[PDB]
Amino acid sequence: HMRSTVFSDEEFSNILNDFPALKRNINGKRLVYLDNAASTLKCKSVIEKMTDFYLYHYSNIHRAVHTLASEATVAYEQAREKVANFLNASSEEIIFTSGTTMGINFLVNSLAKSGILKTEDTVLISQVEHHANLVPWVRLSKFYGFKVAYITADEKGVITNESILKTKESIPNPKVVSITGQSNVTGQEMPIELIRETFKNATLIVDGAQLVPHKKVDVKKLDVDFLVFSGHKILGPTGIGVLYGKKALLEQLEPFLYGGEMIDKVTFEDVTFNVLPYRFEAGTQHITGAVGLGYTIDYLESIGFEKVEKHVEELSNYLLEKMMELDFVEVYGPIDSSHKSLVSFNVKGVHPHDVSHILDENFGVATRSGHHCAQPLMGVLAKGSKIDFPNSTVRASVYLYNTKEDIDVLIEGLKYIRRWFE
């Protein structure tokens, strides 16, 4: 018994067989893939469907008169609809992009050009944001003149409900609030609805890159204005992301990028724009990445996405339990049920890169060491550290095809690393 409360040994066994990378061995040990927070492994049946699409159903899309162009166009718009149903949005509220990062850049630039984010307006973000939801705001404040303010994290990197309510006293009327739906370092799932009510007049953006892959997201319930995520973190193709926005807001936004398809009329001197969603898709999109993403979502819904979520939840609880028992590790983030997907940590007396190196070479375990694209968060964690804090951490992250046994290999690995450095 694989030790699941969610999947039978047969269903689960079938799932694992969908991921050929799991048959890889590193120095004679099976691959134990715990770097899911950076990117995920690919499903053979999904990738075969993309291959069939490239080889037999492919051409450029829209203005479709010939047979392949119709097929490709229909498949692409069908993919948009699968994504809209997955988020409870309408299809004209789904814009295909290159990724989360592009999505955030699209918003900052489009909000400023549309006249919504002005000089001396304030954008409020959190201290635990990924560079993708931090650097565009901080750098572009120098060109457009807005100010950036932060919701502060505690010395373990936690954004408490109290911090959220306290920030509102101090920054009462932010023009934009952009926050992570879940930290790629602390593992903390954020209280999005509490944020939405506390900053009732703000344009609210959620960085969904870590959240969307393992937890149900209903954009109407959350009442977010915009949400972004990346395909490659949900078993999907690279080069494909999603931007969701409220139809009423998208209708007033200046396009980020310009070119073909997004126009209606072009003259040498002026342009007008197409309707939604095409207004915000300039030139040839990642047609096959979109179709592939659609097929990824079909795969997840065939397993059943509530089961995906529960399985990841039980893996997360087990990972965090086992990590908390080790007396020679320091763990970051909340020790509560908001903590999901991943555990960032340091082994006392051992450099993070050595932890990841030995885990990989001697135990076949893939983890990541470093700042995890959250350099300012590291400075916050340093203040609460009780060790000689290396300004970086090790990170183990779980997803669909992981097991409790994978986690037991990680633990065995870490014990070994402690005994080896003494």
Going by C-beta distance under 8 Å and a sequence separation of 6 or more, which residues neighbour residue 291? 50, 53, 75, 76, 78, 79
Q: Which of these segments, 51-59, 203-211, 243-251, 412-420, binds ligand PLP (CB under 6 A)?
A: 203-211
**209 makes contact with ligand PLP (CB under 6 A):** yes
Q: Which does 26 bind (CB under 5 to 8 A by kind): a second copy, ligand PLP, none?
A: a second copy
Q: Which of 9, 17, 21, 145 binds a second copy (CB under 8 A)?
A: 21
| Cα gap 251→249, rounded to integer Å | 5
Q: Residue 304 touches which of a second copy, ligand PLP, none (CB < 5 to 8 A by kind)?
A: none
- Does 175 help bind ligand PLP (rule: CB under 6 A)? no
d(CA 86, CA 284): 24
Pick the closer one to a second copy by CB: 21 or 387: 21
DSSP string, 385-402: -SS---S-EEEEE--TT-
Q: Are 369 and 395 in contact (CB under 8 A)?
A: yes
Non-local CB neighbours of 42 within 8 Å, separated by 6+ positions:
19, 21, 235
User: Does 127 engage in binding with ligand PLP (CB under 6 A)?
Assistant: no
**At its nearest, how many Å lie between a second copy and the CB of residue 331?**
19
254 vs 314 by CB, closer to a second copy: 254
Question: For residue 6, what are its two tokens?
Answer: 């969610």
Residue among 99, 236, 277, 333 that touches ligand PLP (CB under 6 A): 99
User: Applying CB under 6 A, does 132 fall inside the site for ligand PLP?
Assistant: yes
Angle between helices 287-303 and 67-87 (to 10 degrees): 50
Nearer to ligand PLP, 41 or 414 (CB): 41
Enumerate the H helices of 114-156 as residue ranges: 135-144
Q: Which of 64, 149, 373, 411 is catalytic?
A: 373
115 binds a second copy (CB under 8 A): no
Min dist. Cβ of residue 326 to a second copy (A): 21
Indicate the residue among 233 and 279 with the shorter CB distance to ligand PLP: 233
Query: Which residues, including other chains, have CB under 8 Å from residue 147's CB and lie 6 or more apart?
Result: 120, 121, 122, 123, 141
Cis peptide before 334 (omega within 30 of 0): no
Residue 352 makes contact with ligand PLP by CB under 6 A: no
Q: Choosing among a second copy, ligand PLP, none, which partner's interface includes residue 44 (Cβ < 5 to 8 Å by kind)?
A: a second copy
Among a second copy, ligand PLP, none, residue 210 binds (CB under 5-8 Å by kind): ligand PLP
Is 242 or 409 the residue whose CB approaches ligand PLP more closely? 242
Could you tell me the smallest distance in angstroms from the CB atom of residue 228 to ligand PLP?
8
3-state secondary structure of 346: strand
The answer to whether 232 contacts a second copy (rule: CB under 8 A) is yes
Pairing relationship of beta strands 342-347 and 368-370 according to DSSP bridges: unpaired
Question: Is there a contact between 117 and 111 (Cβ–Cβ < 8 Å)?
Answer: yes
CA 176 to CA 148: how far, in whole Å?
Answer: 10
Nearest to 395 by CA among 350, 356, 348: 356
CB 379 → a second copy: shortest distance, Å?
A: 8
Q: Does 130 help bind a second copy (rule: CB under 8 A)?
A: yes
Cβ proximity of 223 and 249 under 8 Å: no
Rounded Cα distance between 338 and 189, Å, is: 5
Contacting residue, 186, 230, 296, 341, with ligand PLP by CB under 6 A: 230
CB nearer to a second copy: pick between 114 and 161: 114
- Asked if 341 and 187 count as a contact pair (C-beta separation under 8 A), the reply is yes
Q: Give me 30's structure tokens.
A: 């099976």
SS3 367: coil
Q: Which does 22 bind (CB under 5 to 8 A by kind): a second copy, ligand PLP, none?
A: none
Question: Is there a catalytic annotation at residue 43?
Answer: no
Task: Rule CB under 8 A: choose which of 14, 67, 78, 391 binds a second copy.
Answer: 67
303 binds a second copy (CB under 8 A): no
- Residues 361-420 close enough to bind a second copy by CB under 8 A: 365-370, 373, 375-376, 379
Tokens coding 93: 């509220």
If the CB atoms of residues 31 and 297 are measured against a second copy, the closer one turns out to be 31
Q: What is the DSSP letter of 337?
A: T
Q: Which residues in this chain contact ligand PLP in the complex, by CB under 6 A?
A: 99-101, 130, 132-133, 180, 184, 207, 209-210, 230, 232-233, 260, 283-284
- Active-site residues, by number, are 373
